């Protein structure tokens, strides 16, 4: 009725702070893993060159 309640009350703030920090850490890790992938596609000039070769030019 008295002792364990008081010590739980004492515990509450530090646990709240640590869990807030943990959530911020999770969000930070989520953000840090984001990279824009630029893709590379076959240049059309080689297609234009193969087209010309096929013509026997």
């Amino acid at each position: 009725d008295i002792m364990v309640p008081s010590f739980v009350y004492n515990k509450l703030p530090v646990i709240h702070f640590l869990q807030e920090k943990r959530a911020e850490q999770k969000l930070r890790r989520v953000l840090d893993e984001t990279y824009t992938e630029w893709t590379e596609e076959l240049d059309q000039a080689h297609v234009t060159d193969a087209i010309t070769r096929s013509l026997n030019i």
Binding site: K11, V14, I15, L18, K21, R22, L27, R28
Partner: protein, 53 residues
């Protein structure tokens, strides 16, 4: 309305964890904070370089 804090505190006290201070975990988590935009740019550049390598 903050169930996680409640459950952790109750469990810690019930298993003889009376102390209310956690210096080591705080030391691990104290400097945590959301990064600035410039820091995000630097980290993204590092990740792009790593992926290219």
């Amino acid at each position: 309305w903050c169930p996680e804090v409640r459950d952790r505190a109750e469990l810690e006290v019930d298993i003889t964890g009376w102390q209310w201070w956690s210096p080591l975990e705080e030391r691990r988590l104290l400097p945590v904070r959301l990064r600035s935009v410039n820091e995000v740019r630097e980290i993204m550049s590092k990740t792009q370089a790593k992926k290219s390598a």
